Design a protein around this ligand. Structure first.
Ligand code: IVF
Length: 213
């Protein structure tokens, strides 16, 4: 069921933020733990930050804020090319139950298309279940996002799910869960962009997780 997989996801979902070691943490979005001390994180969560010298990355896992210096982080790529979502290790993080196998197999991708799906996320504290779909897919495209005073955010994302939907900023980093019960309501990828009633998630497959250990 969708709920069952939403279940697994919620337990592994954390808030991701940036801040100085002894300063205010600025929560930017979500990150999803996948096993051990490894999480999936949209590169956009820190990629436009200015100062890496004194930037710690924060993860809120059960009301406690665990952290690691950007200078000390071990970051692993999911596949070749682009890199909009990476794998990050946070050695002091309370370990996640391995949900790697709930991730869709590359050859199963066509089974998620043209079905609805559910974006399982958080908006400051509050977890939500946002309906989307039916899902489309694009090898390459440039997508609209949120920032209203100096510069908007359009993102060229490769291998991306796109689903009609209405969301809110802060949703990025949440996981997309297929309603297709024949592929076990597989996690399809990570939400990376939301604008114009379209929701975009980078595809993340079971296979990409072979490159961590
Ligand atoms: C797509 C996305 O997540 N955008 C970010 C955003 O606007 N975040 C929220 C705050 C937040 C933090 C942690 C968990 C959920 C929500 C916000 N209204 O600033 C953006 C920072 C890229």
């Amino acid at each position: 069921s969708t709920l069952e997989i939403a279940g697994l996801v919620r337990k592994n979902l954390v808030q991701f933020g940036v801040g100085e070691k002894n300063g205010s943490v600025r929560w930017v979005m979500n990150a999803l733990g996948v096993k051990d001390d490894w999480l999936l994180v949209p590169s956009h969560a820190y990629k436009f930050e200015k100062d890496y010298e004194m930037m710690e990355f924060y993860f809120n896992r059960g009301g406690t804020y665990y952290s690691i210096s950007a200078g000390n982080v071990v970051i692993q790529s999911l596949d070749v090319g682009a890199q909009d979502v990476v794998l990050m290790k946070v050695p002091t993080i309370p370990k996640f139950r391995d949900i790697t196998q709930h991730f869709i197999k590359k050859g199963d991708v066509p089974r998620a298309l043209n079905r609805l799906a559910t974006l399982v996320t958080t908006v400051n504290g509050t977890p939500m279940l946002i309906s989307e779909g039916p899902l489309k897919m694009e090898e390459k495209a440039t997508y609209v996002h949120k920032k209203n005073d100096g510069t908007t955010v359009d993102l060229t994302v490769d291998q991306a799910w796109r689903g009609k939907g209405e969301g809110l900023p802060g949703m990025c980093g949440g996981a997309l869960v297929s309603s297709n019960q024949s592929i076990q309501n597989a996690i399809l990828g990570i939400h990376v962009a939301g604008g114009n009633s379209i929701l975009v998630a980078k595809l993340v497959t079971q296979e990409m997780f072979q490159n961590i250990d």
